[PDB]
Amino acid sequence: ATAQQLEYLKNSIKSIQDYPKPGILFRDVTSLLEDPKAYALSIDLLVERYKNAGITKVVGTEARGFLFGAPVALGLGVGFVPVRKPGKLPRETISETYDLEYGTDQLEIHVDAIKPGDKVLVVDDLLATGGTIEATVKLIRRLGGEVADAAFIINLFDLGGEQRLEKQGITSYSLVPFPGH
Amino acid sequence: TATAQQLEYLKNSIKSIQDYPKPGILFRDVTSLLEDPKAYALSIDLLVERYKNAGITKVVGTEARGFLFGAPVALGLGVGFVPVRKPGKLPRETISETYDLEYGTDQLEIHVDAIKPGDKVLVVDDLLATGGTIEATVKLIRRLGGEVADAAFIINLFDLGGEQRLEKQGITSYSLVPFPGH
Ligand SMILES: [Mg+2]
C-alpha cells in the first residue's frame, strides 16, 4: 500500500469524540463502508497482501468482521468460515471462552469447516485487545488448521493486541493505525 | 439471467438439516454455500448482474447474514453499503423499527445519514422466511427518503409467505434458491 492509499483510508473513517464515554474516540468504519472507493481499496489491499500466501480459508468473527473477511475470501477465491456466538451455527461446533471486562463470552466454529492442512487467514475490522482473535486461533488449531496471519482494517496500537497475537505466533497486518483506548 | 445449471449448482451447495432447530422442519444451511468458493462467488456475481442496470445507489444488509451477501453485492455494483443492525451497535444517530419474532419482538436500526432522498436501495439477505426483518428494513429506508422496490435473497422458503408480505409493500423479491417446507 502506498502512502497515498493509506492516507485515503485513514481519512475515510469517522472518529466520534467522547464515545462511548469522555476521553474515548470511537473509530466508525461505517463511513468507510458507505464510500465505494474506500471500501473497495481496503479489500483490494488485503487481497493483494495474501494472494501468494497459500490461504485456503478465510475466517471472520461476527459481525463487523464479516464485512471484511467475506470480500477478502471472495477476492482470494477461497471459502469463508464464520465464527459466531453460541446459538447461531446449525451444524456441529466446538467452542472457546474469552474474557471481557465484567465476565466472559464464547465463540464457536463449525467442526467441518476447517480441515487438517488448511492454511487460514483471520480477518476482522479492528484490532483492540485481541481477545476474540486469540480464541479464534485456538478454534482453528483444534481442528488441525494452520494459522499464522490476521488482517485488520484498524489497529488500535495502544491496546496491545498485536503483541498478544504474536504470543500465539500470529503476524498482524493492519491498514489504519489509531491511538487511544 | 442465471442458467438452470448455475441455479442447480447453488441449490446443491446448500446443506439441509433434518428436524432442526426442531422436529418437522427441514433447515436450509447457507453456511455450506459460504464454504464453497465457487458457490459463494457465483451467488454474488449473479445478484450483481441482476441489478447492474437498476440504478441502485446503495445496498442495505441486516446484521449479520446481510453483511455476508449484501456487502459483496455493494462492492460488485460499486455503490456504498449500509448496515442495518441490532439495537445499540451503530455509534451515530439512528432511527428504529420493531418487528415480530416467534417469541416476541425486537428492533432494527439504521444510521439516519446513511440514506438520503434520491437514493435507490437494494436490500440483500441470506434467506426469506416470514419477511419480518425485511419489512422493517423497508420502513427504515423509506423513513429516510430512500426508494426501495427490490429485495434479493440466496434462499426463499416460499411456503412461509415472505414474498407476498413484501409485495404488499411494493417490493419485488428475487431469490436464487427456492425451497419448500416450514
Ligand atoms: Mg470473481
CSV table of all heavy atoms in Angstrom, one decimal, chain B residues 41-89:
chain,number,residue,atom,x,y,z
B,41,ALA,N,-19.1,-17.2,-4.8
B,41,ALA,CA,-18.8,-16.3,-5.8
B,41,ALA,C,-19.9,-16.2,-6.9
B,41,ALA,O,-20.3,-15.1,-7.3
B,41,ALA,CB,-17.4,-16.6,-6.5
B,42,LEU,N,-20.4,-17.4,-7.3
B,42,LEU,CA,-21.5,-17.4,-8.3
B,42,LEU,C,-22.7,-16.7,-7.8
B,42,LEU,O,-23.3,-15.9,-8.5
B,42,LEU,CB,-21.8,-18.9,-8.6
B,42,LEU,CG,-23.0,-19.1,-9.4
B,42,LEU,CD1,-22.9,-18.4,-10.8
B,42,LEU,CD2,-23.2,-20.6,-9.6
B,43,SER,N,-23.1,-16.9,-6.5
B,43,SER,CA,-24.3,-16.2,-6.0
B,43,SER,C,-24.1,-14.7,-6.0
B,43,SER,O,-25.0,-13.9,-6.4
B,43,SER,CB,-24.5,-16.7,-4.6
B,43,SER,OG,-23.5,-16.2,-3.7
B,44,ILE,N,-22.9,-14.2,-5.6
B,44,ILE,CA,-22.7,-12.7,-5.6
B,44,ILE,C,-22.7,-12.2,-7.0
B,44,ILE,O,-23.3,-11.2,-7.3
B,44,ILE,CB,-21.4,-12.4,-4.9
B,44,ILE,CG1,-21.4,-12.9,-3.4
B,44,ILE,CG2,-21.1,-10.9,-5.0
B,44,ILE,CD1,-22.6,-12.4,-2.6
B,45,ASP,N,-22.0,-12.9,-7.9
B,45,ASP,CA,-21.9,-12.4,-9.3
B,45,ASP,C,-23.3,-12.3,-9.9
B,45,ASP,O,-23.6,-11.4,-10.7
B,45,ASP,CB,-21.0,-13.3,-10.1
B,45,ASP,CG,-19.5,-13.2,-9.7
B,45,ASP,OD1,-19.2,-12.4,-8.9
B,45,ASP,OD2,-18.7,-14.0,-10.2
B,46,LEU,N,-24.1,-13.3,-9.6
B,46,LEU,CA,-25.5,-13.3,-10.2
B,46,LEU,C,-26.3,-12.2,-9.7
B,46,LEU,O,-27.1,-11.6,-10.5
B,46,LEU,CB,-26.2,-14.7,-9.9
B,46,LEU,CG,-25.6,-15.9,-10.7
B,46,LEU,CD1,-26.3,-17.1,-10.2
B,46,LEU,CD2,-25.9,-15.7,-12.2
B,47,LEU,N,-26.2,-11.9,-8.4
B,47,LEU,CA,-27.0,-10.8,-7.9
B,47,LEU,C,-26.6,-9.5,-8.4
B,47,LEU,O,-27.4,-8.6,-8.7
B,47,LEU,CB,-26.9,-10.8,-6.3
B,47,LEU,CG,-27.6,-12.0,-5.6
B,47,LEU,CD1,-27.4,-11.8,-4.1
B,47,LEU,CD2,-29.0,-12.1,-6.0
B,48,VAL,N,-25.3,-9.3,-8.6
B,48,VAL,CA,-24.8,-8.1,-9.2
B,48,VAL,C,-25.3,-7.9,-10.6
B,48,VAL,O,-25.7,-6.8,-11.0
B,48,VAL,CB,-23.2,-8.1,-9.1
B,48,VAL,CG1,-22.7,-6.9,-9.9
B,48,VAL,CG2,-22.7,-8.0,-7.7
B,49,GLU,N,-25.2,-9.0,-11.4
B,49,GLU,CA,-25.6,-8.9,-12.7
B,49,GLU,C,-27.1,-8.6,-12.9
B,49,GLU,O,-27.6,-7.9,-13.7
B,49,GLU,CB,-25.3,-10.3,-13.4
B,49,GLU,CG,-25.9,-10.4,-14.8
B,49,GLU,CD,-25.0,-9.7,-15.8
B,49,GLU,OE1,-23.9,-9.4,-15.4
B,49,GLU,OE2,-25.4,-9.5,-16.9
B,50,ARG,N,-27.9,-9.1,-11.9
B,50,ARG,CA,-29.4,-8.9,-11.9
B,50,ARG,C,-29.7,-7.4,-11.8
B,50,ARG,O,-30.7,-6.9,-12.4
B,50,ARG,CB,-30.0,-9.7,-10.8
B,50,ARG,CG,-31.5,-9.5,-10.7
B,50,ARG,CD,-32.3,-10.2,-11.7
B,50,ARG,NE,-33.8,-10.2,-11.4
B,50,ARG,CZ,-34.7,-10.9,-12.1
B,50,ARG,NH1,-34.3,-11.7,-13.1
B,50,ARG,NH2,-35.9,-10.8,-11.8
B,51,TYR,N,-28.9,-6.7,-10.9
B,51,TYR,CA,-29.2,-5.3,-10.7
B,51,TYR,C,-28.3,-4.3,-11.2
B,51,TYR,O,-28.4,-3.1,-10.9
B,51,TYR,CB,-29.3,-5.1,-9.1
B,51,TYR,CG,-30.4,-6.0,-8.5
B,51,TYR,CD1,-30.1,-7.2,-7.9
B,51,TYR,CD2,-31.7,-5.5,-8.6
B,51,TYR,CE1,-31.2,-7.9,-7.4
B,51,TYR,CE2,-32.8,-6.3,-8.1
B,51,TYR,CZ,-32.5,-7.5,-7.5
B,51,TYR,OH,-33.5,-8.3,-6.9
B,52,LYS,N,-27.4,-4.7,-12.1
B,52,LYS,CA,-26.4,-3.8,-12.6
B,52,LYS,C,-27.0,-2.6,-13.4
B,52,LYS,O,-26.3,-1.5,-13.5
B,52,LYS,CB,-25.4,-4.5,-13.5
B,52,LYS,CG,-26.0,-5.0,-14.8
B,52,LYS,CD,-24.9,-5.7,-15.7
B,52,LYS,CE,-25.5,-6.1,-17.0
B,52,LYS,NZ,-24.5,-6.9,-17.8
B,53,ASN,N,-28.2,-2.7,-13.9
B,53,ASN,CA,-28.8,-1.7,-14.7
B,53,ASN,C,-30.0,-1.1,-14.0
B,53,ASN,O,-30.8,-0.4,-14.6
B,53,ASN,CB,-29.2,-2.2,-16.1
B,53,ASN,CG,-28.0,-2.5,-17.0
B,53,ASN,OD1,-28.1,-3.3,-17.9
B,53,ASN,ND2,-26.9,-1.8,-16.7
B,54,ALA,N,-30.2,-1.4,-12.7
B,54,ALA,CA,-31.4,-0.9,-12.0
B,54,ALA,C,-31.2,0.4,-11.3
B,54,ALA,O,-32.1,0.9,-10.6
B,54,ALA,CB,-31.7,-2.0,-10.9
B,55,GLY,N,-30.1,1.1,-11.5
B,55,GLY,CA,-29.9,2.4,-10.9
B,55,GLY,C,-29.8,2.4,-9.4
B,55,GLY,O,-30.2,3.4,-8.7
B,56,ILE,N,-29.3,1.3,-8.9
B,56,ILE,CA,-29.1,1.2,-7.4
B,56,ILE,C,-28.0,2.1,-7.0
B,56,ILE,O,-26.9,2.2,-7.6
B,56,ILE,CB,-28.7,-0.3,-7.1
B,56,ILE,CG1,-29.8,-1.2,-7.5
B,56,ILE,CG2,-28.4,-0.4,-5.6
B,56,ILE,CD1,-31.2,-0.9,-7.0
B,57,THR,N,-28.2,2.8,-5.9
B,57,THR,CA,-27.2,3.8,-5.3
B,57,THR,C,-26.7,3.3,-4.0
B,57,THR,O,-25.7,3.9,-3.5
B,57,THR,CB,-27.8,5.2,-5.2
B,57,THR,OG1,-28.9,5.2,-4.2
B,57,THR,CG2,-28.4,5.7,-6.5
B,58,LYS,N,-27.4,2.4,-3.4
B,58,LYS,CA,-27.0,1.9,-2.0
B,58,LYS,C,-27.5,0.5,-1.8
B,58,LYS,O,-28.5,0.1,-2.3
B,58,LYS,CB,-27.6,2.7,-0.9
B,58,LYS,CG,-27.2,4.2,-0.9
B,58,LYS,CD,-25.8,4.4,-0.4
B,58,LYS,CE,-25.5,5.9,-0.4
B,58,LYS,NZ,-24.1,6.2,0.0
B,59,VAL,N,-26.7,-0.4,-1.1
B,59,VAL,CA,-27.1,-1.7,-0.8
B,59,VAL,C,-27.2,-1.7,0.7
B,59,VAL,O,-26.3,-1.3,1.4
B,59,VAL,CB,-26.1,-2.8,-1.3
B,59,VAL,CG1,-26.6,-4.2,-0.8
B,59,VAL,CG2,-26.0,-2.8,-2.8
B,60,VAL,N,-28.4,-2.3,1.2
B,60,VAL,CA,-28.6,-2.4,2.6
B,60,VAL,C,-28.6,-3.9,3.0
B,60,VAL,O,-29.3,-4.7,2.3
B,60,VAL,CB,-29.9,-1.7,3.0
B,60,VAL,CG1,-30.4,-2.2,4.4
B,60,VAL,CG2,-29.8,-0.2,3.0
B,61,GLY,N,-28.0,-4.2,4.1
B,61,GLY,CA,-28.0,-5.6,4.5
B,61,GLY,C,-28.1,-5.6,6.0
B,61,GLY,O,-27.5,-4.8,6.7
B,62,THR,N,-29.0,-6.5,6.6
B,62,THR,CA,-29.2,-6.5,8.0
B,62,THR,C,-28.1,-7.4,8.7
B,62,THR,O,-27.5,-8.3,8.1
B,62,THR,CB,-30.5,-7.2,8.3
B,62,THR,OG1,-30.6,-8.5,7.9
B,62,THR,CG2,-31.7,-6.4,7.7
B,63,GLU,N,-27.8,-7.1,9.9
B,63,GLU,CA,-26.9,-7.9,10.7
B,63,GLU,C,-27.4,-9.4,10.9
B,63,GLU,O,-28.6,-9.6,11.2
B,63,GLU,CB,-26.9,-7.2,12.1
B,63,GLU,CG,-26.0,-8.0,13.1
B,63,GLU,CD,-25.6,-7.1,14.2
B,63,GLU,OE1,-26.1,-5.9,14.2
B,63,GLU,OE2,-24.9,-7.5,15.1
B,64,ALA,N,-26.5,-10.4,10.7
B,64,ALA,CA,-25.1,-10.3,10.1
B,64,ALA,C,-25.0,-11.1,8.8
B,64,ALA,O,-24.0,-10.9,8.1
B,64,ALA,CB,-24.2,-11.0,11.2
B,65,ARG,N,-26.0,-11.9,8.5
B,65,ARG,CA,-26.0,-12.6,7.2
B,65,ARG,C,-26.1,-11.6,6.0
B,65,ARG,O,-25.6,-11.8,4.9
B,65,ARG,CB,-27.3,-13.5,7.1
B,65,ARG,CG,-27.0,-14.8,7.9
B,65,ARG,CD,-26.0,-15.7,7.2
B,65,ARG,NE,-25.4,-16.7,8.1
B,65,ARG,CZ,-26.2,-17.6,8.6
B,65,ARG,NH1,-27.5,-17.6,8.2
B,65,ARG,NH2,-25.7,-18.5,9.4
B,66,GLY,N,-26.9,-10.5,6.2
B,66,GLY,CA,-27.0,-9.5,5.2
B,66,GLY,C,-25.6,-8.8,4.9
B,66,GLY,O,-25.4,-8.3,3.8
B,67,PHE,N,-24.8,-8.8,5.9
B,67,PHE,CA,-23.4,-8.4,5.7
B,67,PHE,C,-22.7,-9.3,4.7
B,67,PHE,O,-22.1,-8.8,3.7
B,67,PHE,CB,-22.7,-8.5,7.1
B,67,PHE,CG,-23.1,-7.4,8.0
B,67,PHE,CD1,-24.3,-6.7,7.8
B,67,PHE,CD2,-22.4,-7.2,9.2
B,67,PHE,CE1,-24.8,-5.8,8.7
B,67,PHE,CE2,-22.9,-6.3,10.1
B,67,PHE,CZ,-24.1,-5.6,9.9
B,68,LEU,N,-22.8,-10.6,4.9
B,68,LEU,CA,-22.2,-11.6,4.0
B,68,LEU,C,-22.6,-11.6,2.6
B,68,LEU,O,-21.8,-11.9,1.7
B,68,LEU,CB,-22.4,-13.0,4.6
B,68,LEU,CG,-21.7,-13.2,6.0
B,68,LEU,CD1,-22.1,-14.6,6.5
B,68,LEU,CD2,-20.2,-13.2,5.8
B,69,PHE,N,-23.8,-11.2,2.3
B,69,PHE,CA,-24.3,-11.2,0.9
B,69,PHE,C,-24.5,-9.8,0.4
B,69,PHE,O,-24.2,-9.6,-0.8
B,69,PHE,CB,-25.6,-12.1,0.8
B,69,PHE,CG,-25.3,-13.5,1.1
B,69,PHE,CD1,-25.7,-14.1,2.4
B,69,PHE,CD2,-24.6,-14.3,0.2
B,69,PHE,CE1,-25.3,-15.4,2.7
B,69,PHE,CE2,-24.3,-15.6,0.6
B,69,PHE,CZ,-24.7,-16.2,1.8
B,70,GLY,N,-25.0,-8.9,1.2
B,70,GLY,CA,-25.2,-7.5,0.7
B,70,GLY,C,-23.9,-6.8,0.5
B,70,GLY,O,-23.8,-6.0,-0.5
B,71,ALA,N,-22.9,-6.9,1.4
B,71,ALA,CA,-21.6,-6.2,1.2
B,71,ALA,C,-20.9,-6.5,-0.1
B,71,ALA,O,-20.5,-5.6,-0.8
B,71,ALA,CB,-20.7,-6.4,2.4
B,72,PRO,N,-20.8,-7.8,-0.4
B,72,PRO,CA,-20.1,-8.2,-1.7
B,72,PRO,C,-20.9,-7.7,-2.9
B,72,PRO,O,-20.3,-7.3,-3.9
B,72,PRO,CB,-20.0,-9.7,-1.7
B,72,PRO,CG,-19.9,-10.0,-0.2
B,72,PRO,CD,-20.9,-9.0,0.4
B,73,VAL,N,-22.2,-7.6,-2.8
B,73,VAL,CA,-23.0,-7.1,-3.9
B,73,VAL,C,-22.8,-5.6,-4.1
B,73,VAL,O,-22.7,-5.1,-5.2
B,73,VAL,CB,-24.5,-7.4,-3.7
B,73,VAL,CG1,-25.4,-6.6,-4.7
B,73,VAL,CG2,-24.8,-8.9,-3.8
B,74,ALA,N,-22.7,-4.9,-2.9
B,74,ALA,CA,-22.4,-3.4,-3.0
B,74,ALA,C,-21.0,-3.2,-3.7
B,74,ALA,O,-20.9,-2.3,-4.5
B,74,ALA,CB,-22.3,-2.9,-1.6
B,75,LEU,N,-20.0,-4.0,-3.3
B,75,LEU,CA,-18.7,-3.9,-4.0
B,75,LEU,C,-18.8,-4.2,-5.4
B,75,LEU,O,-18.2,-3.6,-6.3
B,75,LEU,CB,-17.7,-4.9,-3.3
B,75,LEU,CG,-17.3,-4.4,-1.9
B,75,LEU,CD1,-16.7,-5.6,-1.1
B,75,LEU,CD2,-16.3,-3.3,-2.0
B,76,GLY,N,-19.6,-5.2,-5.8
B,76,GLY,CA,-19.7,-5.6,-7.2
B,76,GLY,C,-20.4,-4.5,-8.0
B,76,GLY,O,-20.1,-4.3,-9.2
B,77,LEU,N,-21.4,-3.8,-7.4
B,77,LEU,CA,-22.1,-2.7,-8.1
B,77,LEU,C,-21.3,-1.4,-8.0
B,77,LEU,O,-21.6,-0.4,-8.7
B,77,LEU,CB,-23.5,-2.5,-7.5
B,77,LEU,CG,-24.5,-3.6,-7.7
B,77,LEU,CD1,-25.7,-3.4,-6.8
B,77,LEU,CD2,-24.9,-3.7,-9.2
B,78,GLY,N,-20.3,-1.3,-7.1
B,78,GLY,CA,-19.6,-0.1,-6.9
B,78,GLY,C,-20.3,1.0,-6.2
B,78,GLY,O,-20.2,2.2,-6.5
B,79,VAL,N,-21.2,0.6,-5.3
B,79,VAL,CA,-22.0,1.5,-4.5
B,79,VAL,C,-21.8,1.3,-3.0
B,79,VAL,O,-21.3,0.2,-2.6
B,79,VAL,CB,-23.5,1.4,-4.8
B,79,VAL,CG1,-23.7,1.7,-6.3
B,79,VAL,CG2,-24.1,0.1,-4.4
B,80,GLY,N,-22.2,2.3,-2.2
B,80,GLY,CA,-22.0,2.1,-0.8
B,80,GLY,C,-22.8,1.1,-0.1
B,80,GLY,O,-23.9,0.8,-0.6
B,81,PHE,N,-22.3,0.5,1.0
B,81,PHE,CA,-23.1,-0.5,1.7
B,81,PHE,C,-23.5,0.1,3.0
B,81,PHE,O,-22.7,0.8,3.7
B,81,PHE,CB,-22.2,-1.7,2.0
B,81,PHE,CG,-22.9,-2.7,2.9
B,81,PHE,CD1,-23.9,-3.5,2.4
B,81,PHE,CD2,-22.6,-2.8,4.3
B,81,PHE,CE1,-24.6,-4.4,3.2
B,81,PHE,CE2,-23.3,-3.7,5.1
B,81,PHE,CZ,-24.3,-4.5,4.5
B,82,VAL,N,-24.7,-0.1,3.4
B,82,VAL,CA,-25.3,0.4,4.6
B,82,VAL,C,-25.8,-0.7,5.5
B,82,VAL,O,-26.7,-1.4,5.1
B,82,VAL,CB,-26.5,1.4,4.3
B,82,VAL,CG1,-27.1,1.9,5.6
B,82,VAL,CG2,-26.0,2.6,3.5
B,83,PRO,N,-25.2,-0.9,6.7
B,83,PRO,CA,-25.7,-1.9,7.6
B,83,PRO,C,-26.9,-1.5,8.4
B,83,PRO,O,-27.1,-0.4,8.9
B,83,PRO,CB,-24.5,-2.2,8.5
B,83,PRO,CG,-23.9,-0.8,8.7
B,83,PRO,CD,-24.0,-0.2,7.2
B,84,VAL,N,-27.8,-2.5,8.6
B,84,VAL,CA,-29.0,-2.3,9.5
B,84,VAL,C,-28.7,-3.2,10.6
B,84,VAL,O,-28.4,-4.4,10.4
B,84,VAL,CB,-30.3,-2.7,8.8
B,84,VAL,CG1,-31.4,-2.9,9.8
B,84,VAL,CG2,-30.7,-1.6,7.8
B,85,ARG,N,-28.6,-2.7,11.8
B,85,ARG,CA,-28.2,-3.5,13.0
B,85,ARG,C,-29.1,-3.7,14.1
B,85,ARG,O,-30.1,-3.0,14.3
B,85,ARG,CB,-26.9,-3.0,13.5
B,85,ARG,CG,-25.8,-2.8,12.4
B,85,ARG,CD,-24.4,-2.7,13.0
B,85,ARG,NE,-24.1,-3.9,13.8
B,85,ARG,CZ,-23.0,-4.2,14.4
B,85,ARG,NH1,-22.0,-3.3,14.4
B,85,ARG,NH2,-22.8,-5.3,15.1
B,86,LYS,N,-28.7,-4.6,15.0
B,86,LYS,CA,-29.4,-4.8,16.3
B,86,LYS,C,-29.2,-3.6,17.1
B,86,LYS,O,-28.3,-2.8,16.9
B,86,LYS,CB,-28.8,-6.0,17.0
B,86,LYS,CG,-28.8,-7.3,16.2
B,86,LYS,CD,-28.1,-8.4,17.0
B,86,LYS,CE,-28.1,-9.7,16.2
B,86,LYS,NZ,-27.4,-10.8,16.9
B,87,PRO,N,-30.1,-3.3,18.0
B,87,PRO,CA,-30.0,-2.1,18.9
B,87,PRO,C,-28.7,-1.9,19.6
B,87,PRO,O,-28.1,-2.8,20.1
B,87,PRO,CB,-31.2,-2.3,19.8
B,87,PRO,CG,-32.2,-3.1,19.1
B,87,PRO,CD,-31.3,-4.1,18.4
B,88,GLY,N,-28.3,-0.6,19.6
B,88,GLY,CA,-27.1,-0.2,20.3
B,88,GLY,C,-25.8,-0.5,19.7
B,88,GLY,O,-24.7,-0.3,20.4
B,89,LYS,N,-25.7,-0.9,18.5
B,89,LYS,CA,-24.5,-1.3,17.8
B,89,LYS,C,-23.9,-0.1,17.0
B,89,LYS,O,-22.7,0.2,17.0
B,89,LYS,CB,-24.6,-2.5,17.0
B,89,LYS,CG,-25.0,-3.7,17.8
B,89,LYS,CD,-23.9,-4.1,18.8
B,89,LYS,CE,-24.4,-5.2,19.7
B,89,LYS,NZ,-25.6,-4.8,20.5
